[PDB]
Structure formats: C-alpha cells, structure tokens
Design a protein around this ligand. Structure first.
Ligand SMILES: [Zn+2]
Ligand SMILES: [Zn+2]
Ligand SMILES: [Zn+2]
Lengths: 42, 284, 276, 36
C-alpha cells in the first residue's frame, strides 16, 4: 500500500450510505455519515 | 474582499450551470477517478456522480431526491439538496453565513487544468478547524482544485479536475435521468429535536445544532458550522471503556470517558478541538 | 492466449490511426501529474500534442517525423522521431511482433476502467530480467485506459491512467493549427563489450563526451557508460522512479549503467563487461 | 500523492553532478536515437 498507486480506495466517494469497543465506533462512524446526508440543508 | 464574492459565484455556478467534471479524489486510501454531471431541467437540479473504475457505484439526484446504486445491492432513495461527497463540501457552502467566522484570503491566480484560476483560502477565524485552499475557473467559476489541509499545512484530501466542459443546453444522458424509473424514497426520522441533560459548554465559533436524536442507547447531537460537521455522542460508560483518538483521513473519532459517561466526538475536526469539546460537556 | 498479442497490436494500431484526446494522470512516487494527449492524422501524417495541464504551460508537439519541445523561459527546438517520448508509456509505441520471441503476453481478464470494459494484459519478458507491464485497453476504441509499470517482484513503479477521453473521426481544429504551424529550429567502435545482455536487447547507437553505448529491446532502453577516472568514484545504486543508475568500479574503470532495468539486472551487466 | 507538479514532468524539455549528467544524456539519447 503506497496510497498513490491504489486506484480503488476503501469507501470511495460514490459508495452507498450504510443504514444498519471498536465495532461500536465503526457504527458511530457510519451513523455520522448517514446523518450528514439526511441533513444536507444547503 | 472580492474573495468572499468569488466564492458565492463559484457556489452559484455549481448549482446553475450545466456541466461535467472528470476529476480525481486523492487521500491516504489512494487516487479515485470520478465524474460529476450537473444540470437543470424544469426548475430542478439533475446530477450524477459516477465511480469510473471497478464496480459501477453511482449516485443520482433529481430535485430533492438522492438515489444510490451499487452492484449487488437494492437501490434506495433519500431526500437531500445535493449528493454529499460528489464535490467537496466547500463547494456546497453558503459563504454568506460563513463570513462572520471565516476569513477568505487571496493567494493569487494560477493555472489548473489549462485554465486561469483565482486561488483562495478558507480558514476558520478561531483557528479551531481544518482549512481549505480552492482554485476556481475565472471564466466558468467552477472549482478546478480543492485541497483540505490539516492544522499543520499537511493535505488531508485533494479534489482535482482533469477535464470538464460547460454546456449551454442539457445533454441527453441527464434528460433520461429525469425520466428514469428511480428507486422508492425510504423513510427515516428527520427533524428530531431531542432533549438531553448533558450540554456542550464549549464549541468553536460558528457551530450550531442541526439535529438531536436518541438513536444500547446513544444520544447523538449533530453540529455544523455550514462547512464542517460532527456529532457529539453520549452513552453510559462501561467496565472496559477507554479514552481514544482515532483519525481516518479527515474524520476524527475521540472517545472521552468522564463521570461514568462515554463521550465520543465524530467528524471533520482537528483531534485537539474534538477533545476540548468532549471535556466541556456538562452532565446534569 | 494468442488473442493477447492480437489485442496489443490492435491497441498500437488504434493509437497510431485514430484521432482522439486522452485526459490522463501520470503517477510515480514523485507525485500525480495532470496531462493531456491529442492525436490525429492529416493526409496520412501524424499530428499530436502532449500538454502539461497545471503549472507552467510546457508542451511537446509532433508533426510527421518532427518533434518540438516548448517550455516558457527555455527555448524551442525540434528533433526527429516517430512519436513523442513519455507522452504515453513506451508500451503503446512498441512493436509486439518484434519482441514476441522474448516476451509473454498474458491475459488477466476483463474489468472496468474509465467507465469502459477493458481487456487486461500483462507483458513480461520470458527471462524474468525486466520490469513488466499491465495494460487495460478499451474493448471498443482499443485505446489504452490504464498502464502500470511493475518491478520484477510486483512493486508498482509508475501509473498511466486515463480519466476522460474522446474519439473523433473528425480532426480537431487546434490540430489543424498545428498542421500549418512553423516549428522551432532542428537540433562507433568501442573498446569494451558487455558479455551478458538480457534476451532481446540490441545496441542502437554509440557516442562520447565518456564511453557510452545505448541498448534497447523494443520496449525498454538503457545506456552503459564507462569512463576511467576515480576521484571519489564509488560503488552505488539509485532509483529515480523507473530509472535506475547502477555505478561500480573495477580495473581502474567506473561502470555506470543508466536506464529502465531492475537493479540486480543492471549490476549483472556492469560486472559481465569484458574490458579491452 | 498530493504533489500536483512532479519535478521532471512528462512535458519537460529533454559530486552528485556526474550522475545527473549521465541521466540527462540517457534521456536525450533515447529521444534522438528513438525507434520505429
Ligand atoms: Zn435536517
Ligand atoms: Zn499533520
Ligand atoms: Zn453516458
């Protein structure tokens, strides 16, 4: 992994937003994302 | 200065013009090839973010409906005013509301994608956040490059246009999008303004709560200064909890344990800001 | 998979025969560079432009067997050649028929790149002495969408990746301007011999100004420089990306090999030189 | 990875001064005496 040559990054920009002590923070992470999109009031 | 106005123009161009940007997204996970198409038809936006290599992941927007498609998954639609992560948040920002707590500073003009661009920096006034450097096309006013920088000048992420075009009239591919038989809108609670006994005593200048929910109970309070966002989560501490500080590119995760409560900050903030916020939450 | 060789020849032909524009990035440890390559054919004569997209406006153009180099601040000149070097990976301008006797063309399958279904092909020298190439070519236009240069043990040395492109049976207008443009001014037995050369390499030239010989196998090239002086002259090895520079001393002679060869391979050549 | 303009770009005109010298000649030589 030389970030530079990896063309298919983990969790690309077009990845679908997931709906549903480490795995608890993996859930707090994708809940933050879910929220960002449910509240994009531009 | 003229900057603040240039940024409003860049934002306006992004929602008004018909165009296609073929760009790359660079971070520590790699270099991603993407394409973003935007247009307006019958008084509403049309947009598509397409993953160019590998699985045909794709996001489509028709009015306030955001549909997500991924090979081997049931498509689904949500409501939103644009496709998040299709362009940096900076581009979907209302610079007017930001001006009170951000400085817009000029670095000059330079060439990007064979275009002369105005180079502008967007940095919080109370030095508590990540900053942005934006290169915009002097003609179309569209973003050609956008760098998200951490507090020590290092780049967390870069948006870079490799090719693009602006069309006076709508392409046929967007025209079909309007007719597209898009997946059904899903329902998810939106607008909860939950009541909690704990309160974030300190918050950087500009943030405000845009949601409050009690979504194994977790009490989340989402904030945004119009550009950056993060959630403050509180649940009852357990036998083996611990202070934590993880960093996934631009997203921070800071777990602070105090008074039997497990505090966790998640979002686009320098680790130090996230912790200072966590230790200023007053319980009861 | 003999189809592999046929596919590679198709990609070469397409790169030579079509009118098209490729918007690509070039990636190495030194960074990510935004570039644009335009190609066309007017009256059976190739026209092409390689333009640096960000920063200084450096460009290289081609017309017939003439290659012009532009770069603000410096001064324009022209060389003779059939194609612009480093405008696309060497793999594109190579004659697969010639190197078929010492290279294997292996199909890796098909996959999506730049929103196109591509044939994936590995180009490897049978003797295992060189870097290998992996090509992703568009099944429709036959043009290369991605090209990776790899080290003998899988380390990616460099990447060519198309981000956007168009194919036009019709000639661009700016290429018509290049068609009428006035381009800038235009600009050997040795003592020792390399006893060991990877299968397929042949000398193509010689010169001096030190004793230097240029080699090429139709895809990769390297120079073996020999001078007999020694201030601090010492044994060293460096790799500026795909470019290797192996230096060694012996018999009061410094041996410097420069080029597209894995370090081990270069070192072997330096040692197997039989001095006169 | 974030280096927008790599030194020694693709569209550049064709003690540590001995190597960098043999390096520039290699580039000229593969262009002057190219192939096909
Ligand atoms: Zn909301
Ligand atoms: Zn840092
Ligand atoms: Zn299409």
């Amino acid at each position: 992994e030389t970030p530079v040559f990896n063309t298919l990054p983990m969790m690309g920009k077009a990845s679908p937003v997931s709906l549903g002590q480490r795995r608890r923070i993996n859930a707090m992470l994708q809940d933050y994302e879910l929220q960002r999109r449910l509240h994009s009031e531009q | 200065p003229a900057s603040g106005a240039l940024l409003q123009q860049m934002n306006l161009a992004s929602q008004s013009l018909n165009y296609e940007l073929s760009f790359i997204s660079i971070n520590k996970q790699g270099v991603e090839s993407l394409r973003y198409r935007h247009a307006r038809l019958d008084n509403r936006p049309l947009a598509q973010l397409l993953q160019m290599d590998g699985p045909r992941r794709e996001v489509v927007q028709r009015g306030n409906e955001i549909s997500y498609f991924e090979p081997g998954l049931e498509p689904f639609t949500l409501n939103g005013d644009y496709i998040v992560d299709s362009l940096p948040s900076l581009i979907y920002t209302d610079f007017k509301r930001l001006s009170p707590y951000y400085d817009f500073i000029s670095v000059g003009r330079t060439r990007i994608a064979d275009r002369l661009c105005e180079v502008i920096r967007v940095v919080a006034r109370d030095g508590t956040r990540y900053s942005y450097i934006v290169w915009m096309d002097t003609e179309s006013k569209l973003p050609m490059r956008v760098d998200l920088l951490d507090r020590d000048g290092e780049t967390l992420e870069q948006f870079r246009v490799i090719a693009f075009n602006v069309n006076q009239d709508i392409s046929s591919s967007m025209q079909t999008l309007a007719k597209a038989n898009l997946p059904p809108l899903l329902s998810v609670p939106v607008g909860e303004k939950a009541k909690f006994s704990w309160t974030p005593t300190w918050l950087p200048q500009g943030f405000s709560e845009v949601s409050s929910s009690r979504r194994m109970p977790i009490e989340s309070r989402l904030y945004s200064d119009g550009l950056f966002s993060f959630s403050v989560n509180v649940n009852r501490a357990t036998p083996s909890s611990t202070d934590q500080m993880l960093r996934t590119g631009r997203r921070t995760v800071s777990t602070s344990v105090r008074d039997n409560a497990e505090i966790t900050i998640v979002g686009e903030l320098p680790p130090q800001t996230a912790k200072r916020i966590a230790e200023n939450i007053k319980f009861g």
